[PDB]
Amino acid sequence: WQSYRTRLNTLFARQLVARATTGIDTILSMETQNIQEPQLGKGFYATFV
Amino acid sequence: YKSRLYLLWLEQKEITKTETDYRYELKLAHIRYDGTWN
Structure with a gap:
């Protein structure tokens, strides 16, 4: 949209499947909630303080 | 996988x-979380 990129989908569930093999205790854990997804095309991340 | x-x-x-x-065709199916198959 103009110069913005909005993520439309998610890959969370795909990574969740492997974690899920140990049950609910893992599925609902904080570590699970820290799953990362790929960046939206060419670009980079940066910190501005 | x-x-x-x-x-x-x-x-x-x-x-x-x-x-x-x-x-000839190759087919692939998998287990879902509730135990059913796709």
Whole structure:
């Protein structure tokens, strides 16, 4: 949209499947909630303080 | 794959061209979280 990129989908569930093999205790854990997804095309991340 | 069980198999379909020949397809299915299959 103009110069913005909005993520439309998610890959969370795909990574969740492997974690899920140990049950609910893992599925609902904080570590699970820290799953990362790929960046939206060419670009980079940066910190501005 | 992706720590999930998948079943992969090859199937043969008979096609009339007459003469007989065969078409081949590969199928893949997997277990869902509720135990059902896709």
